[PDB]
């Protein structure tokens, strides 16, 4: 069990960090503490683009 | 119906010259505009 998860993240954890991580950075970007958009343009209907840091904040 | 006629195609021609000019600047107009728009104050006009 000890070898068996060591591995695991030359395998299992590359989805997971994929998926967990590179999609949610996508663009300088389940419980959510935290969430941020960088230009995103959509065409009003879902726009959203939300900063939550205090800091450039959005509308 | 006689004369008329000759100068309304001139009209409506330079009309149409003005209307691929703005075609072009409808797409950009509306396109260097950034639609995530930031929210700011101006201090000073």
Same mark, same amino acid.
């Given at each position: 069990?000890?070898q068996?998860? +060591?591995?695991?993240?030359?395998?299992?954890?590359?989805? @997971?960090?994929?998926? $967990?991580?590179?999609?949610?950075d996508? $663009?300088?970007? !389940?419980?959510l503490?935290?969430?941020?958009c960088?230009?995103?343009?959509?065409?009003?209907d879902? @726009?959203?683009v *939300? +900063?939550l840091?205090? *800091?450039?904040k959005?509308? | 119906?006689? *004369?008329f006629?000759?100068? /309304?195609q001139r009209?409506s !021609?330079?009309? +149409?010259?003005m209307?691929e000019? *703005?075609?072009?600047?409808?797409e950009?107009?509306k396109? +260097?505009?950034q /639609?995530?728009y930031?929210?700011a104050?101006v201090?000073?006009?």
């Open positions: 069990l000890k068996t998860e +060591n591995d695991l993240k030359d395998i299992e954890a590359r989805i @997971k960090e994929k998926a $967990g991580v590179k999609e949610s996508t $663009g300088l970007a !389940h419980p503490q935290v969430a941020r960088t230009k995103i343009i959509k065409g009003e879902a @726009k959203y *939300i +900063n840091k205090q *800091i450039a959005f509308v | 119906i006689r *004369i006629r000759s100068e /309304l009209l !021609h330079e009309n +149409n010259v209307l000019k *703005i075609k072009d600047n409808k950009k107009i396109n +260097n505009r /639609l995530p930031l929210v104050n201090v000073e006009v």
